[PDB]
Amino acid sequence: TNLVKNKCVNFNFNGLTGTGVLTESNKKFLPFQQFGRDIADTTDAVRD
Amino acid sequence: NQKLIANQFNSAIGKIQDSLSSTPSALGKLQDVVNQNAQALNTLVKQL
Numbered sequence: 001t002n003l004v005k006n007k008c009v010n011f012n013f014n015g016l017t018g019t020g021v022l023t024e025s026n027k028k029f030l031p032f033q034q035f036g037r038d039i040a041d042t043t044d045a046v047r048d
Numbered sequence: 049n050q051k052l053i054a055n056q057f058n059s060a061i062g063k064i065q066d067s068l069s070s071t072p073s074a075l076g077k078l079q080d081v082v083n084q085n086a087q088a089l090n091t092l093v094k095q096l
Contacts, residue, residue, distance in 0.1 A: 040096045 003048065013046050 003022070010019045016035075025045050027036060036045030068074045
């Protein structure tokens with residue numbers, strides 16, 4: 001389904017389920033990298 | 049000895065500023081409180 005940004009949304013990405021606001025990320029993600037995680041297991045950043 | 053006492057008092061006050069600045073551990077007591085709280089909170093988050 002079409003990506004939605006700047007609004008609370010329930011998101012299932014490649015079998016990963018979470019509810020959070022989606023915003024564009026200025027993170028310099030390395031190409032090999034697919035997920036960015038905080039101290040907690042929850043995924044801070046995701047690649048489409 | 050009013051004049052003498054006044055000079056002594058003024059001199060002592062002047063040193064106070066220098067003392068706190070030079071001694072990094074001067075405010076260690078206050079700093080400890082901050083660290084302990086932060087430390088505890090990090091642990092809680094890590095446990096998740």
